[PDB]
Design a protein around this motif. Structure first.
Motif, PDB file in Angstrom:
ATOM      1  N   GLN A   1      32.719   0.245 115.787  1.00  0.00           N
ATOM      2  CA  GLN A   1      32.258   2.471 116.004  1.00  0.00           C
ATOM      3  C   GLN A   1      32.242   2.496 114.002  1.00  0.00           C
ATOM      4  OE1 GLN A   1      36.073   4.287 115.199  1.00  0.00           O
ATOM      5  NE2 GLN A   1      35.046   5.579 113.833  1.00  0.00           N
ATOM      6  N   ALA A   2      31.013   3.164 114.367  1.00  0.00           N
ATOM      7  CA  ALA A   2      29.747   3.348 113.973  1.00  0.00           C
ATOM      8  C   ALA A   2      30.462   4.896 112.296  1.00  0.00           C
ATOM      9  CB  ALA A   2      28.854   3.004 113.135  1.00  0.00           C
ATOM     10  N   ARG A   3      30.204   4.283 111.161  1.00  0.00           N
ATOM     11  CA  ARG A   3      30.467   5.544 110.703  1.00  0.00           C
ATOM     12  C   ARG A   3      28.591   6.541 109.409  1.00  0.00           C
ATOM     13  NH1 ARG A   3      34.983   6.692 107.185  1.00  0.00           N
ATOM     14  NH2 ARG A   3      36.228   8.262 107.678  1.00  0.00           N
ATOM     15  N   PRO A   4      28.575   7.697 109.793  1.00  0.00           N
ATOM     16  CA  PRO A   4      27.443   8.424 108.749  1.00  0.00           C
ATOM     17  C   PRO A   4      28.216   8.465 107.600  1.00  0.00           C
ATOM     18  CG  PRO A   4      28.254   9.119 110.519  1.00  0.00           C
ATOM     19  CD  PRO A   4      29.196   8.976 110.735  1.00  0.00           C
ATOM     20  N   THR A   5      27.272   7.495 106.393  1.00  0.00           N
ATOM     21  CA  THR A   5      28.061   7.289 105.186  1.00  0.00           C
ATOM     22  C   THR A   5      26.214   7.121 103.962  1.00  0.00           C
ATOM     23  OG1 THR A   5      29.171   5.471 105.564  1.00  0.00           O
ATOM     24  CG2 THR A   5      27.996   4.862 103.185  1.00  0.00           C
ATOM     25  N   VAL A   6      26.888   7.993 103.013  1.00  0.00           N
ATOM     26  CA  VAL A   6      25.743   8.585 102.725  1.00  0.00           C
ATOM     27  C   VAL A   6      25.308   7.607 101.058  1.00  0.00           C
ATOM     28  CG1 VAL A   6      25.096  10.334 100.761  1.00  0.00           C
ATOM     29  CG2 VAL A   6      26.632  10.975 102.617  1.00  0.00           C
ATOM     30  N   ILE A   7      24.458   6.863 101.508  1.00  0.00           N
ATOM     31  CA  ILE A   7      24.078   5.733 100.411  1.00  0.00           C
ATOM     32  C   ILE A   7      23.034   6.673  99.548  1.00  0.00           C
ATOM     33  CG2 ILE A   7      22.608   3.789  99.994  1.00  0.00           C
ATOM     34  CD1 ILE A   7      25.202   3.546 100.663  1.00  0.00           C
ATOM     35  N   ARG A   8      23.245   7.207  97.731  1.00  0.00           N
ATOM     36  CA  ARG A   8      22.501   7.993  97.170  1.00  0.00           C
ATOM     37  C   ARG A   8      22.274   6.739  95.759  1.00  0.00           C
ATOM     38  NH1 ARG A   8      24.789  11.961  93.720  1.00  0.00           N
ATOM     39  NH2 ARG A   8      23.932  12.896  91.654  1.00  0.00           N
ATOM     40  N   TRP A   9      20.360   6.568  95.741  1.00  0.00           N
ATOM     41  CA  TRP A   9      20.341   5.825  94.795  1.00  0.00           C
ATOM     42  C   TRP A   9      20.046   7.179  93.459  1.00  0.00           C
ATOM     43  CZ3 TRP A   9      19.102   0.661  92.582  1.00  0.00           C
ATOM     44  CH2 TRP A   9      18.589   0.319  91.789  1.00  0.00           C
ATOM     45  N   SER A  10      20.752   6.755  92.106  1.00  0.00           N
ATOM     46  CA  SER A  10      19.607   7.907  91.138  1.00  0.00           C
ATOM     47  C   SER A  10      19.283   6.965  89.815  1.00  0.00           C
ATOM     48  CB  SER A  10      21.378   8.238  91.258  1.00  0.00           C
ATOM     49  OG  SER A  10      22.272   7.595  90.484  1.00  0.00           O
ATOM     50  N   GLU A  11      18.521   6.007  89.928  1.00  0.00           N
ATOM     51  CA  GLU A  11      18.083   5.418  89.089  1.00  0.00           C
ATOM     52  C   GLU A  11      17.026   5.542  88.863  1.00  0.00           C
ATOM     53  OE1 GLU A  11      21.255   3.367  87.061  1.00  0.00           O
ATOM     54  OE2 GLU A  11      21.597   4.600  88.471  1.00  0.00           O
ATOM     55  N   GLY A  12      16.691   6.076  89.494  1.00  0.00           N
ATOM     56  CA  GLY A  12      15.288   6.747  89.489  1.00  0.00           C
ATOM     57  C   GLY A  12      14.171   4.935  90.085  1.00  0.00           C
ATOM     58  N   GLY A  13      13.045   5.731  90.327  1.00  0.00           N
ATOM     59  CA  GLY A  13      11.620   5.118  90.812  1.00  0.00           C
ATOM     60  C   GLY A  13      10.654   5.607  91.808  1.00  0.00           C
ATOM     61  N   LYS A  14      10.108   4.976  91.917  1.00  0.00           N
ATOM     62  CA  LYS A  14       9.385   5.749  93.217  1.00  0.00           C
ATOM     63  C   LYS A  14       9.624   5.931  94.892  1.00  0.00           C
ATOM     64  CE  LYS A  14       6.760   9.404  90.982  1.00  0.00           C
ATOM     65  NZ  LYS A  14       7.865   9.304  89.844  1.00  0.00           N
ATOM     66  N   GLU A  15       9.849   4.363  95.241  1.00  0.00           N
ATOM     67  CA  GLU A  15       9.655   4.209  97.012  1.00  0.00           C
ATOM     68  C   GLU A  15      10.965   3.633  96.586  1.00  0.00           C
ATOM     69  OE1 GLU A  15       6.736   1.522  98.558  1.00  0.00           O
ATOM     70  OE2 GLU A  15       6.335   2.558  99.937  1.00  0.00           O
ATOM     71  N   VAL A  16      11.640   3.759  97.277  1.00  0.00           N
ATOM     72  CA  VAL A  16      13.306   3.054  98.118  1.00  0.00           C
ATOM     73  C   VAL A  16      13.729   3.225  99.083  1.00  0.00           C
ATOM     74  CG1 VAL A  16      16.051   2.485  97.127  1.00  0.00           C
ATOM     75  CG2 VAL A  16      14.010   4.364  95.733  1.00  0.00           C
ATOM     76  N   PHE A  17      14.191   1.400  98.957  1.00  0.00           N
ATOM     77  CA  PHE A  17      14.652   0.881 100.216  1.00  0.00           C
ATOM     78  C   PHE A  17      15.811   0.587  99.921  1.00  0.00           C
ATOM     79  CE2 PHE A  17      10.162   0.936 101.087  1.00  0.00           C
ATOM     80  CZ  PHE A  17       9.815   0.758 101.837  1.00  0.00           C
ATOM     81  N   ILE A  18      16.670   0.196 101.391  1.00  0.00           N
ATOM     82  CA  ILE A  18      18.112  -0.196 101.370  1.00  0.00           C
ATOM     83  C   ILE A  18      18.180  -1.459 102.728  1.00  0.00           C
ATOM     84  CG2 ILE A  18      19.520   1.262 103.030  1.00  0.00           C
ATOM     85  CD1 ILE A  18      22.054   1.280 101.330  1.00  0.00           C
ATOM     86  N   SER A  19      18.665  -2.561 101.858  1.00  0.00           N
ATOM     87  CA  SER A  19      18.997  -3.573 103.155  1.00  0.00           C
ATOM     88  C   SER A  19      20.111  -4.815 103.032  1.00  0.00           C
ATOM     89  CB  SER A  19      18.306  -4.476 103.477  1.00  0.00           C
ATOM     90  OG  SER A  19      17.929  -5.528 104.529  1.00  0.00           O
ATOM     91  N   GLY A  20      20.939  -4.947 104.094  1.00  0.00           N
ATOM     92  CA  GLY A  20      22.445  -5.456 103.676  1.00  0.00           C
ATOM     93  C   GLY A  20      22.844  -6.132 105.367  1.00  0.00           C
ATOM     94  N   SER A  21      24.279  -6.703 104.447  1.00  0.00           N
ATOM     95  CA  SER A  21      24.802  -7.756 105.370  1.00  0.00           C
ATOM     96  C   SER A  21      24.958  -6.867 106.848  1.00  0.00           C
ATOM     97  CB  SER A  21      25.897  -8.051 104.968  1.00  0.00           C
ATOM     98  OG  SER A  21      26.632  -6.875 104.937  1.00  0.00           O
TER      99      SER A  21
END
Length: 89
Positions: A1-21
């Motif tokens: 059972q899944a939750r909406p989870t906020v991921i925030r990248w705040s060290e800046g850059g121009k193009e961000v993605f996330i991947s993970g386990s």
């Protein structure tokens, strides 16, 4: 059972993605720009997940979040997702 989870990248850059386990490092999810910041909301099951960001072409971790060393020897961020059992009441 899944939750909406906020991921925030705040060290800046121009193009961000996330991947993970949580998806076995199979795909990258884009993070949406908003005032110096990049954010996404993720449907993630209870428990602990390792994750990392792809920022302007480089795999990088968030230095403001906890980290862990993978089985592969990499430095990944770790998020704990809280169980949402009985939160309706």
């Amino acid at each position: 059972q899944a939750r909406p989870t906020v991921i925030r990248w705040s060290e800046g850059g121009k193009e961000v993605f996330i991947s993970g386990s949580f998806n076995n490092w199979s795909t990258k999810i884009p993070l949406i720009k908003s005032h110096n910041d990049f954010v996404a909301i993720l449907d993630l099951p209870e428990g602990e997940h390792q994750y990392k960001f792809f920022v302007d072409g480089q795999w990088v971790h968030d230095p403001s979040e906890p980290v862990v060393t993978s089985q592969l020897g990499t430095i990944n961020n770790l998020i704990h997702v809280k169980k949402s059992d009985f939160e309706v009441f």
